[PDB]
């Protein structure tokens with residue numbers, strides 16, 4: 001078996017420093033070397049390239065075979081690479097650094113609503129059963145739920161509330177927390193968010209990790225992005241607890 005002393009490699013950042021060339025420099029000749037690039041990718045070859053969209057420290061492992069022996073180094077990637085990051089994620093986060101908090105558009109009509117959902121034969125693309133007037137859900141927990149997006153190591157999201165989410169009878173029946181009836185009707189349900197979440201954006205699909213939802217519980221973590229720009233995030237979702245019911249939500253930046 002190779003001796004940890006016999007083995008070496010270089011990790012050289014390119015003109016794009018998020019793309020790193022890994023080269024076997026070991027004191028023994030014609031070993032077979034495999035790599036763990038620290039980013040979920042493994043490779044085999046004397047010289048391979050690794051790409052890291054996100055600023056972080058990463059552990060690279062080279063394994064030489066004659067037996068097998070493994071050595072590691074850490075690399076620091078200094079800055080997020082916009083060329084390898086989902087563009088809509090950067091709008092959600094307000095940029096490649098920092099964070100951006102989004103809140104219900106409570107001051108304008110139509111920031112929450114319900115209608116035939118996209119699989120329903122009556123779908124018309126709008127919350128045609130009920131559309132919330134400005135401040136219509138002031139008297140419940142709905143507007144206390146705020147969502148922060150940030151690209152600190154990955155597609156990260158922070159969910160803050162004051163310990164409650166808003167839902168209806170169908171939703172309350174799927175959640176363990178105590179339910180209360182607030183001034184706006186339906187149900188507040190005790191629900192404490194996890195300290196950290198992730199998200200994915202694939203085309204117009206926004207998915208939240210760990211069964212998260214945008215303050216209003218309808219049994220799904222999948223949203224359809226209808227509008228996303230620096231001033232507005234307009235979402236549809238399809239209820240998993242009331243077949244064929246669709247919900248609409250409009251978020252704007254926290255001021």
Ligand SMILES: OC[C@H]1O[C@@H](O[C@H]2[C@H](O)[C@@H](O)[C@H](O[C@@H]3[C@@H](O)[C@H](O)O[C@H](CO)[C@H]3O)O[C@@H]2CO)[C@H](O)[C@@H](O)[C@@H]1O
Nearest residue numbers: 114115129130131137166167168184185186187242245
């Ligand atoms: O048109 C029949 C259609 O109605 C669905 O139920 C709707 C109902 O029409 C809406 O009036 C109702 O709106 C609720 C608001 O009045 C309330 O103030 O706020 C809550 C949100 O907190 C609104 O839900 O919504 C229900 C859907 O939840 C039926 O479900 C559907 O089967 C039927 O075809």
